[PDB]
Design a protein around this ligand. Sequence first.
Ligand code: HC4
Length: 125
Amino acid sequence: MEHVAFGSEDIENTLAKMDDGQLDGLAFGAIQLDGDGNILQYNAAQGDITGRDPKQVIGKNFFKDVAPCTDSPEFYGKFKEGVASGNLNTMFEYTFDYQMTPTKVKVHMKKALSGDSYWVFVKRV
Ligand SMILES: *C(=O)/C=C/c1ccc(O)cc1
């Protein structure tokens, strides 16, 4: 288990060290996206929240294919503004309801420390 709190101020520094197995040790869902929204990493906690099988969604586009209910100004619009700006740090509640029981969550999106990739962190509320 990786001991990291959801919403921590320096979360991007702490998760910069994590391979897929380490990410699977977190208490919350974690997705790493490229600037187009393609999934680079998707952890076990996230799959428990959403029902998706992690290795099956890596490589898919989060907004176009996996999570169309997030293709909205309230989620994807924030993401793409942050990619365009090169800076992103926002936390909001959302409901995931595509081919699943509607599930209310808290989402924290934050630009990764290095390069140009973006974290999406999720926990139940
Ligand atoms: C709405 O379509 C939400 C879907 C969803 C959210 C998060 C995931 O990791 C997978 C699917």
